[PDB]
A paper describes a structure:
Seneca Valley virus (SVV) is an oncolytic picornavirus that selectively targets cancer cells by recognizing Tumor endothelial marker 8 (TEM8) as the host receptor. SVV has a typical picornavirus capsid with four capsid proteins; VP1, VP2, and VP3 are characterized by a single jelly roll fold, where eight beta-strands form a barrel-like structure that is distributed at the exterior of the virus, while VP4 is located on the interior of the capsid. The structural architecture consists of four capsid proteins forming a protomer, 5 protomers forming a pentamer, and 12 pentamers assembling into a pseudo T=3 capsid, approximately ~32 nm in diameter. We used cryo-electron microscopy to investigate SVV under acidic conditions and in complex with TEM8 at physiological pH, identifying multiple uncoating intermediates.
We used cryo-EM to image SVV particles after incubation at pH 5 and 37°C with purified TEM8 to explore the structural behavior of SVV. For both physiological and acidic conditions, the A-particles were resolved to 3.4 Å, while for the ER-particles, the resolutions were 6.4 and 4.3 Å, respectively. The A-particles obtained in both conditions are expanded by ~5% in diameter compared to the F-particle. This expansion results in reduced capsid protein contacts compared to the F-particle. Inter-pentamer contacts are reduced by 34% and 22% under acidic and physiological conditions, respectively. For the A-particle[P], additional disordered regions without interpretable density include VP1 (G13, S20, and S28), VP2 (D12), and VP3 (E61-S66), while for the A-particle[C], these include VP3 (P60-D67). On the capsid exterior, the A-particle[P] had the following partially ordered regions: the VP1 HI loop (S229), VP1 BC loop (A65), VP1 Loop II (G97), and VP2 residues V59 and D67, while the A-particle[C] exhibited similar behavior showing partially ordered regions: VP1 HI loop (T230) and VP1 Loop II (P95-G97). For the A-particle[C], the disordered regions were on the VP1 N-terminus (E11-S28) and VP4 residues G63 to N66. Density corresponding to TEM8 was not visible on the SVV A- and ER-particles under acidic conditions, suggesting that at low pH, the virus potentially loses the affinity for the receptor or binds transiently. In the SVV A-particle, its genome is reorganized and lacks defined capsid-RNA interactions with the inner capsid surface, likely contributing to the flexibility of the VP1 N-terminus, which is consequently poorly resolved.
Residue numbers in the entry:
A (entry chain B), B (entry chain B): 1 to 59, 68 to 238
C (entry chain D), D (entry chain D), E (entry chain D): 14 to 38, 63 to 72
F (entry chain A): 1 to 258
G (entry chain A): 1 to 52
H (entry chain C): 12 to 279
Write the structure that this text describes.
Amino acid sequence: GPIPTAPRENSLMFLSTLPDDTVPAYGNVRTPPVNYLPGEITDLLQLARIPTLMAFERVTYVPYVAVPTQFDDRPLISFPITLSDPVYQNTLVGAISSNFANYRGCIQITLTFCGPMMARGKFLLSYSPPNGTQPQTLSEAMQCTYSIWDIGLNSSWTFVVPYISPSDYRETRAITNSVYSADGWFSLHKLTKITLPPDCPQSPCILFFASAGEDYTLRLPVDCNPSYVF
Amino acid sequence: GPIPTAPRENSLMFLSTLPDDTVPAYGNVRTPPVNYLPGEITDLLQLARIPTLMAFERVTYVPYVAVPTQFDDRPLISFPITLSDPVYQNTLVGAISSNFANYRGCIQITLTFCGPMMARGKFLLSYSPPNGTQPQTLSEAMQCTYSIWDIGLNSSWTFVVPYISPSDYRETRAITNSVYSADGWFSLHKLTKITLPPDCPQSPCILFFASAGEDYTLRLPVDCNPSYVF
Amino acid sequence: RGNNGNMTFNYYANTYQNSVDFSTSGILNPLGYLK
Amino acid sequence: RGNNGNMTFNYYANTYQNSVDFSTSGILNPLGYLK
Amino acid sequence: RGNNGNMTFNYYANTYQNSVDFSTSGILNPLGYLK
Amino acid sequence: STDNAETGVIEAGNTDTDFSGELAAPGSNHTNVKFLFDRSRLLNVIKVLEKDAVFPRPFPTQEGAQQDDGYFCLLTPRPTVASRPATRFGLYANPSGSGVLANTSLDFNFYSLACFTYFRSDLEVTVVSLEPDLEFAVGWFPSGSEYQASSFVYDQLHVPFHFTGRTPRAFASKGGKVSFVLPWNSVSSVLPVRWGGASKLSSATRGLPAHADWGTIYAFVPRPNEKKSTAVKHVAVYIRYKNARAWCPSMLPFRSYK
Amino acid sequence: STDNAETGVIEAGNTDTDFSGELAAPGSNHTNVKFLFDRSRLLNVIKVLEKD
Amino acid sequence: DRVTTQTAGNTAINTQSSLGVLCAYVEDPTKSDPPSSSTDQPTTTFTAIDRWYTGRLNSWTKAVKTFSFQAVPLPGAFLSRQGGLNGGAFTATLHRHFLMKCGWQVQVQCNLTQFHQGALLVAMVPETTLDVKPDGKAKSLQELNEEQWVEMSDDYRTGKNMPFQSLGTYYRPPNWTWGPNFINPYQVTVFPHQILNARTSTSVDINVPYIGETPTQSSETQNSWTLLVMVLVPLDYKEGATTDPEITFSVRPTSPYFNGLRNRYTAG
């Protein structure tokens, strides 16, 4: 005999994200093998963990920064830590992160000196947690978390921004500067002036790379912005 | 108690190709036995693998080709390899293939000499992969894949067109001459002129057959063309 | 067998779903032989 | 696996629900090596 | 547990029906103590 | 930490490498490629057939040719124009002047997350009506075929041929929806997100693949030719990749800086 | 390969018979007669009775 | 220990300052199996094509801006004799077949010294169309002597100038604003690459396996891999030093295969 049943209030509804399959129409098809293609990607983090070049303003954009010769106490360059900020816009970390809502883990920064082999100097890198006003001098910078990097044989030096947050997970866009979106600043200080022998070009250049850390993680997908087509 | 359930968005739909059965109406019927009929067909390849006669233009169509007596360097006859081409139209291989979309395997061609028993001669058969322009001389033909066939006691000679393709499976119709539809040409060359004794008819005739190979295969059915009724 | 996707459950009995012939009391084989 | 919630029952056969490749006869590994 | 009447069958998997807390590496007891 | 970036390979680190600290817990794995792409989305909007159609001709078409436009939709994330594959996406910023306007489409989300080079997956289709209380049907044929164009006379009532055929045709009740899944049926093993070859051996257009799609779809009204109405109708098409895979990294679009 | 077509029976061959090569894999079996014909199709259109 | 020598056939290459060899995706990029989409007897490698072929690029000058680049389509370089490259046996065998598949090995050389400043990025972009003019026809050898270094602009950034299928006159021409072959300069480091600068090294070596949408591709049109050179930091040097450094590169095919023998190819 017929099994008696009563459908629920939710019937004939079409839900895009429903976690289930549907009815086939043209089954029994067999396809060519794909064993010959190497380098299968299993998770997009594999691509998020590859360094890429950032951008700045030369006033009209370049990835590097030119070390001046004048003497002043302001930071050489400083940008905030917010994945929606323009500097991270074109880097892979930012581009992928803009399609989600939350993140964890430690961000990573890398530099490389491309000046003459005969030069010598030292630089100071610091990371300042949030405050009423951002740092503006070496004395203030020394107190926060910082490290000293000196020009030598090896060319590059890596820096890690620790994950220090009042809550697990953080927003990936800053509609307003709540403590859950913005997380301080990063700034670079020229500790000592550069020394060059006679008859050498002045004003060397330095280069930046940005990538995800070891324990980086994303979550909660979201729809993407199509404005690029225009 | 009633089992609660919620039907999906796809309900009351009629799908022709759905892989399932329906409700019976007049069951319990028993039918006569059919053990007495021999030669049950299980797969249409059994019929696709039977040779049949092709066609050409005598200018108005005949299956054979008449060997002339004049001397010239052009191929005696040449036709493309495309199942939608007219020459294969009425043969079983082409007729069946026109109802599907893809194919594999090796095509097969066969010839038979029906001239006087007293004649002697030799012929050259060649198959040219795709190129900018098709072959037009024996010197060019020799380089491609080819074989030499000589008139003797036995009358017929079989030729196999290898499956050399840039991808698995190939289209069975040529809307445009992409590399996935057209696959070169086949041409026949008269290596030496025929020798006949006095008081014998001139211009012998040769006959063609076309069939599927051992490893031939079809796939992905498609609807058929009803124009024949007119 | 055939264009039938179900492989687990059959509701009606075989003699009601299909017709049957009442009793009386791999690779493809070729058609046409020569000896 | 994937965005599929069911874990107990499948009605249709595998060869009808999915496409298959015909035969012929953990932590993430890195891309790009140096030696 | 709760205002849930079913006690025999669950269709979807637990990790899809409910939210879970990711790991890290009787009579009513009283509130407020004096010593 | 000292390192050399010129070597190409750089080992990812943690906070503890140069300072006192510890590593964080995993969390969740929402970045999985298979789990990311199994979500339906809009693809294109097309009209509904009310008679036998004439498939559009190839692109070199001159003026004065008679055909039906905007009735067929391709199933492919790549750009398309006039129901035929294309290479550059189009946009009409000045709807004025003579000439027929070309239909266009694209998969914005797919190309916003198109970080790889090759792709392969099954595909599930759905259709939805944009008019109140409409009756319609949907038809389909695989990649590398063509649509039959003629009709038959039953009881002096013309009936288009696309009613019948051994390739799927589906019907829906008043206000209903149509849903089903398709296999990967192209001859090519994988679908190229970006390509740089040529199909024809000569006079070809470089970078234009030949069979990078699943098939073709259209909709029609189940009534004879004698009931051609006076108002146009539209439907919407939804697609959803299933069991996806990727094969080789690439770069993402260029987000312009104001 | 030498053969006689007048006998009616001709044995199907492969590429390797006369050249260097190998045979291809089976593929799929969509040509099966039982599987081919199980598809609905239109047959006729008729009117509807309103009396005897 | 920064000194290495690579040998093959009757040729050998060396270097006084090396940084390593980068393997693209696998442990042994040379290992490969014959294609499964053809049944004729293939043609494996013979000792007369296991070589390194050398060519010359255009010279680097200080007037070049940032992100300017030069491209070299690998299988097309032999066929077009770009930069004086000539394959000899390899070219002769490639002109007499229908199908081909193979990996590659490449290396580039420069001669900057400790008194110069600059950087160059070398990467292998797969599936690109930088070698075709906007009208859709391959660039002639005369165009390269005029456009010494390819400029960079929004058109290239957005792929707005890709090869174009004429749409006739029945329609109304639309506005083209985006294409799938765009180039994103800031993300070029995704592909296998090495960075070349004055102070560190003078050569870069990359090893790459085969890739394609089918097991094999047509000989006369496949363009899967492409070599790329781009400027990151513009050159500068003190007055009086050496000017206009030269550039050179060498290529090697690995584990080739061929199918579909025929006579010499001819366009038509």
